[PDB]
Amino acid sequence: NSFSGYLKLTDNVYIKNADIVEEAKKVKPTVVVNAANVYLKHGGGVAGALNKATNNAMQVESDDYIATNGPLKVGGSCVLSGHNLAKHCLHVVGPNVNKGEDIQLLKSAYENFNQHEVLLAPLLSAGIFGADPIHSLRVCVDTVRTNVYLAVFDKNLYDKLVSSFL
Numbered sequence: 815n816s817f818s819g820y821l822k823l824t825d826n827v828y829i830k831n832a833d834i835v836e837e838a839k840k841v842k843p844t845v846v847v848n849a850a851n852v853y854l855k856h857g858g859g860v861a862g863a864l865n866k867a868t869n870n871a872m873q874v875e876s877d878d879y880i881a882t883n884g885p886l887k888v889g890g891s892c893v894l895s896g897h898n899l900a901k902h903c904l905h906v907v908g909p910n911v912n913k914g915e916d917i918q919l920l921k922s923a924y925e926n927f928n929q930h931e932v933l934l935a936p937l938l939s940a941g942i943f944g945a946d947p948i949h950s951l952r953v954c955v956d957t958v959r960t961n962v963y964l965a966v967f968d969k970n971l972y973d974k975l976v977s978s979f980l
């Protein structure tokens with residue numbers, strides 16, 4: 815978990831302008847978080863990038879999890895193999911507010927991070943899930959009590975977050 819170049823926002827939250835896939839290949843953390851959907855179909859955004867970096871091994875594995883256990887609930891999670899990215903992948907389902915899902919579930923999504931001591935994660939519900947990314951960071955800071963290293967791909971978004979926080 816040799817994280818470098820992070821800015822400490824709170825006692826347990828760190829932030830960096832970086833591609834989470836590149837961070838996972840360098841650090842090889844214990845846990846890499848995926849911003850997933852209830853059926854674990856990793857077709858775009860963070861999910862698409864993480865799956866692509868495993869050459870579809872994450873998708874094949876996920877399809878087998880769904881076949882055996884059924885879909886996740888919004889706000890829920892499951893732990894799968896991290897393959898070549900991490901020891902484990904914590905797939906987390908944030909609400910899709912652009913499809914009417916309740917924003918209050920963003921807290922439930924972040925509560926999953928608390929089961930792991932150290933995590934490399936993206937912001938939840940901030941892609942096509944349509945939630946405000948600055949609001950998503952506020953819920954993260956208020957909810958997660960374990961050590962989370964957030965990797966933010968977009969430099970424009972990164973600078974807006976760092977400015978709003980500090």
Ligand SMILES: O=C(O)[C@@H]1CCC[C@H]1c1ccc2cnccc2c1
Nearest residue numbers: 859860863937940941965966967968
């Ligand atoms: O950090 C960000 O800018 C956004 C915020 C929530 C989803 C993040 C995202 C989206 C697409 C990505 C594509 N490739 C690699 C990492 C990617 C990360």
